[PDB]
Amino acid sequence: GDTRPRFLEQVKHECHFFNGTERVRFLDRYFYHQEEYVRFDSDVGEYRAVTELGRPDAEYWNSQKDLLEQKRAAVDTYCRHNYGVGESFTVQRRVYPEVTVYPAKTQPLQHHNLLVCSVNGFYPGSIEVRWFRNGQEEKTGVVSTGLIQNGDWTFQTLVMLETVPRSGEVYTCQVEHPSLTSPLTVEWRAR
Amino acid sequence: KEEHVIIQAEFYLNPDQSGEFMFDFDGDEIFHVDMAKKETVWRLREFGRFASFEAQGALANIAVDKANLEIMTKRSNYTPITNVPPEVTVLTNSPVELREPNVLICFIDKFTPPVVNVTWLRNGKPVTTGVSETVFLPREDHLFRKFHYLPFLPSTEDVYDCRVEHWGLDEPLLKHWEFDAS
């Protein structure tokens, strides 16, 4: 119903952390709608225009010698500071995956099926999910959602295996995750 | 290759006069400041015991962001934002198990501006019992994402839709979820 034009300003104060806080990169970024127009990159050490829209800000801000000395210290006063504050519940956050395995379809053996490995509730995002048939890795016929961020400091991923289940077979889903000291495996005996 | 990124993301929108201030660690919200109530709101209750933030510092950032918007609006010769409609997906938190409480997640992704009406529908009727949501989370492409949540007990008697209104959409978008007995 609205008849009216919208205008959006964004700002992103980014702290990028490498090997702990050994190397830190501070990036102050300014955006008009989705267009970055000017930034301070600690690697560069002054404001730079990202687009021509940016130039009056970059020239004017780069004339303010105390604004520069302050932005130049931010890796320490802002980035390293905030890392110390949140480290214990962000960096150190680890939540086990829950692993469920089921056939996508209920049906007799000797028919094509998808075996679902649902891996849920885990943190952080890095994970490896592998499929095995009678102890041998299945590298073909694997369909993954990839990583789903749930927005509540947990992730999930569904890794499906294409197969024709036969009477002898045992299928194992194996998960590796920073929360786990050794790999977590769940079996499905062809039913 | 980087281990971690913390982002202090801010926006101001005209003529709606909407502001947002939030911290983000590896894509997840640590907190935002409610501008109206001038208070730090932690994404998980637990975080408010692990750390603190003075809501005050945010109000001043937003006022300088409103001023800069108005400079950039003129500088751009009143060039407006182009609406980008959201992609919407409805998933469970975990696999559906009879007698196990679960959560429907409505993932609203890759949209701008950061203004959106989201309703949960159970059998075509609005639900508010136990619903919750995020503010607008920043993307690396300077679009937004947002999450809404509905706790439920699994039932073949119920169907759900997440109904999203955005200016980039011609019509309200309903994304469907049901757990089939088949």
């Binding site: 104060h13 102050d28 802002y78 905030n82 504050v85 | 603190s52 933030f53 950032n61 962001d65 400079i71």
Partner: peptide
């Protein structure tokens, strides 16, 4: 003890 907010300058009017 808590999180610091990074401030930002006003633009060239």
């Amino acid at each position: 003890a808590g999180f610091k907010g990074e401030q930002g300058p006003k633009g060239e009017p």
